[PDB]
Amino acid sequence: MQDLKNTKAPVSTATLNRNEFDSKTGNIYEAISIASKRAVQINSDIKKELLEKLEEFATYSDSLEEVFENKEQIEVSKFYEKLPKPHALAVQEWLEDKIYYRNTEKDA
């Protein structure tokens, strides 16, 4: 699993160098497609980890109130919220050559 605590991906939108992004494939569109597929995978993994963590801190309350207050759950959710977005993590992985891609049609 990725070390989300020590990730170098930018938190917000940043001006990325297009030449570095498409250097490996020679086509910015192919790189964008690969990055988005990896971003979908990263988002799935992050959702699974967050769901497990929330289930660990989930408290069973039988009250019929519409608003609940769980400070530990709120803190965990805030920590996950402050992390970079999945697509930013995918871009950071792509820049660091941490994404493996293969074209099935070209290798057939």
7 near other proteins, rule: CB under 8 A: no
Listed ranges 17-25, 61-69, 92-100: which one lies at the site for other proteins (CB under 8 A) = 61-69
* Inter-helix orientation angle 71-81/28-57, to 10°: 170
Nearest alpha carbon to residue 97 among 23, 44, 3: 23
Q: Smallest distance, Å, CB 15 to other proteins?
A: 10
Secondary structure class of 99 (helix, strand, coil): coil
2 near other proteins, rule: CB under 8 A: no
**Ramachandran assignment for 26, one of left (phi > 0), alpha (psi -120 to 50 degrees), beta (any other):** left
State the residues that interact with other proteins by CB under 8 A: 10-13, 32-33, 36, 39-40, 43, 50, 54, 58, 66-70, 73-74, 77-78, 80-82, 84-88, 90
